[PDB]
Amino acid sequence: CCSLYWYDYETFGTDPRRDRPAQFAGIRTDLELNPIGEPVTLFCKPARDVLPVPEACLITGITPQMAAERGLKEAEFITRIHEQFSVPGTCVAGYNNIRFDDEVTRHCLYRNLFDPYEREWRNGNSRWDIIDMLRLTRALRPEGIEWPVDGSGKPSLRLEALTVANGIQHAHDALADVRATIAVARLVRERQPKLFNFVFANRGKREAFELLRFGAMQPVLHVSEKYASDRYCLAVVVALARHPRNPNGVVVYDLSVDPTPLIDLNAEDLRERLFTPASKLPPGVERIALKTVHLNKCPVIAPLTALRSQDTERLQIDLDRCNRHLDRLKREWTLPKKIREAMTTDDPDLMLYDGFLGDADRAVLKWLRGLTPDELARAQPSFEDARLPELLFRYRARNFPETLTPEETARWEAYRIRRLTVEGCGGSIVLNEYLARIEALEASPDLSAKDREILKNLREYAREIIS
Ligand SMILES: [Mg+2]
Numbered sequence: 001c002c003s004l005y006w007y008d009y010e011t012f013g014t015d016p017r018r019d020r021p022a023q024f025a026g027i028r029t030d031l032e033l034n035p036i037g038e039p040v041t042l043f044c045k046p047a048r049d050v051l052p053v054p055e056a057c058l059i060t061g062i063t064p065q066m067a068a069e070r071g072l073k074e075a076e077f078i079t080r081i082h083e084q085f086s087v088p089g090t091c092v093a094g095y096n097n098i099r100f101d102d103e104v105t106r107h108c109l110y111r112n113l114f115d116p117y118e119r120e121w122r123n124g125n126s127r128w129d130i131i132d133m134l135r136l137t138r139a140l141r142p143e144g145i146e147w148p149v150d151g152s153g154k155p156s157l158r159l160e161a162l163t164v165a166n167g168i169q170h171a172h173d174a175l176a177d178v179r180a181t182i183a184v185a186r187l188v189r190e191r192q193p194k195l196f197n198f199v200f201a202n203r204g205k206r207e208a209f210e211l212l213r214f215g216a217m218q219p220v221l222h223v224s225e226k227y228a229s230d231r232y233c234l235a236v237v238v239a240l241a242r243h244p245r246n247p248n249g250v251v252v253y254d255l256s257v258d259p260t261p262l263i264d265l266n267a268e269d270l271r272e273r274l275f276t277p278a279s280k281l282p283p284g285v286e287r288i289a290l291k292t293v294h295l296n297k298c299p300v301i302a303p304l305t306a307l308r309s310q311d312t313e314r315l316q317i318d319l320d321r322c323n324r325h326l327d328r329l330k331r332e333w334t335l336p337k338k339i340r341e342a343m344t345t346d347d348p349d350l351m352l353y354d355g356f357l358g359d360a361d362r363a364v365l366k367w368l369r370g371l372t373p374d375e376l377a378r379a380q381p382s383f384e385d386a387r388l389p390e391l392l393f394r395y396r397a398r399n400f401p402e403t404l405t406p407e408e409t410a411r412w413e414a415y416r417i418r419r420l421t422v423e424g425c426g427g428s429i430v431l432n433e434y435l436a437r438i439e440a441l442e443a444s445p446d447l448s449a450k451d452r453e454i455l456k457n458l459r460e461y462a463r464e465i466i467s
Helices: 054-060 064-070 074-085 101-111 118-124 131-140 159-165 174-191 193-201 205-212 260-264 267-275 309-314 319-330 335-342 359-370 373-378 388-399 406-421 431-442 449-465
Strands: 003-011 021-029 040-043 090-093 220-223 234-242 249-254 290-294 300-303
Touching: 003 054, 003 074, 003 101, 003 174, 021 074, 021 174, 040 064, 040 074, 054 431, 054 449, 064 449, 074 090, 074 101, 074 388, 090 118, 101 388, 131 174, 131 193, 131 220, 131 234, 131 300, 159 174, 174 193, 205 249, 205 300, 234 290, 234 319, 234 335, 260 335, 267 335, 359 388, 373 388, 388 406, 406 431, 431 449
Parallel strands: 003 090
Antiparallel strands: 003 021, 021 040, 220 234, 220 300, 234 249, 249 290
8 A cells, every 4th residue: 555755845055965945845646646635835944054045045936034934843844744754655756856855855854863764665665756767758768748848959858848848737836846747747657658667666776776687798778867968868888887885886887988998997097087077088088988876766777678770760879889899898807896996074964974873873863852842951862873962952952942051052153153154064155155146146137026025035034143
């Protein structure tokens, strides 16, 4: 008895690690994509160490004042989301959620004393994202769907362009985005049900690994944001090695690129070119066409035999050339080891991926969360993980500031102000940039009345937050 929970954030900036959520929209559906129960819509009050990015507030229309006025404390905000997410059998899905919104969720759970991952895998739960399914559909079975292009003819998967081009539309608040996501998913399910079921059924770690055929040197299709839109985000790849550090990474080679440099260079030169940003490569030297597949992120892979002859022709795929390159790679006994060889703080808010929680810590965290604000002030717990002490403090200071001692309040105030004002103290943006970016935006000739009010609100928020 499983369900799909579709969601989206509007946030105060584009850095999931540092910029906090402002709005959440959620809609649960059955596996037919028909809604169950009511949509959820929540605002999150910004804690008093938050400085939003001006441009984001203009795009969303959401000021810190609006969020404070209509929202919940972050603890309750995330607890209500966590409730919906952790209902057994729930697959939590969205549109580009895995590489953005889910990171916002992980960091938010983390700060608020939840395990960042349990909602993703316990009690039959899982994740999904439709963006790579759409990339595969457009690349491999585009029939029956209008694939929009922008003004200069470049391909676009933007939610609004896609929905209008296919006549399933009906502004950018989170709720409209979520409903448009569900509708786009329905459209794929209707026009290409077999692909839809293939991608969905194969979305998990185990199943994605199996599709890679590691290590039979079998070429497969892989779609990714990292491959060029001019090639429909698709490449013919082969899995060559497990990633040295990331246990969920498999490194794959784009068989359209001459592998001579990968074969000929030593481990030192290979590491060098592989860590040189493409912009900084010398002239005549292209990049090493290796790419990491993150098995835990619902990567989309299909067998080479999914190509019909019109698809190969349409995608301008040279199978012989790929085969020729594959032959050369099969001959190198040492290549996997060489690849693995070539590929090899402080702030608790920035240390989510520094290590996993123990079973013990998880238990004390749960107990602390069950307490009332008063009980929580008296707790005096003991942690195995070194990150949790300071982390517990900020959680109390942000959501329950009336619960602090006089000297605790002075500690919060020192941290709070220097996060708001000094570079590298947690925030993506500090007060002076915030004001400078407000100035830049104020100088433009094409501000709406609404834009001005928002920029006015932002000035007032900065004035108020430092007093
Ligand atoms: Mg979104």
